[PDB]
C-alpha cells in the first residue's frame, strides 16, 4: 500500500461467489418455453442443462 519501500503495511481483499442448483423432474413444452422466455437481474449467471 505504499509507492516505495515499506514492506509490511499490506491490504487484504476477498471476492465471494454464491451458487445454487434447481432440478425439474417432469417438464412439458409450455413450461420449457416459459423458462426460456424469462429475464432476470443484471448480476446473476444462469446455466440450463437438458
Amino acid at each position: 500500500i505504499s509507492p516505495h519501500v515499506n514492506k509490511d503495511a499490506r491490504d487484504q481483499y476477498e471476492i465471494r461467489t454464491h451458487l445454487r442448483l434447481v432440478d425439474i423432474v417432469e417438464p412439458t413444452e409450455k413450461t420449457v418455453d416459459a423458462l426460456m422466455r424469462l429475464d432476470l437481474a443484471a448480476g446473476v449467471d444462469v446455466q440450463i442443462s437438458l
Partner: protein, 100 residues
Amino acid sequence: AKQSMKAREVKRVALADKYFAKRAELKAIISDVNASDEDRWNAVLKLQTLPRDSSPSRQRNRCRQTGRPHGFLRKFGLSRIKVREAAMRGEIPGLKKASW
C-alpha cells in the same frame, strides 16, 4: 513508462499473432520421433530465420493504465496501486476488505 516501450509491446503481440501456425508446424516436425533425420535439420535451421519478436516468451505483462513492469495481477489487468485505487472508489464488483 516511456511512450516507446508500449509501442514495443504492441509490435510484439502483432507479430506473435501473425506467425502462430507456421511455428507450431515446424516445432511438431522437430519434436516428432521417427523422422527422416534431414527434415529435422531443415526444420531446425528454418525456425531461426523467422523474426525474433514472434516468440510468445519475449512479451512482458504491463499495467493497462500506466505501463508498470512490476506488481502485476492477472485477474484485473492492473498493478497493485491502481487496483487499490479502483477498489476503494467502488469500481471492482464484489471486492471488499477481508478479515477472518
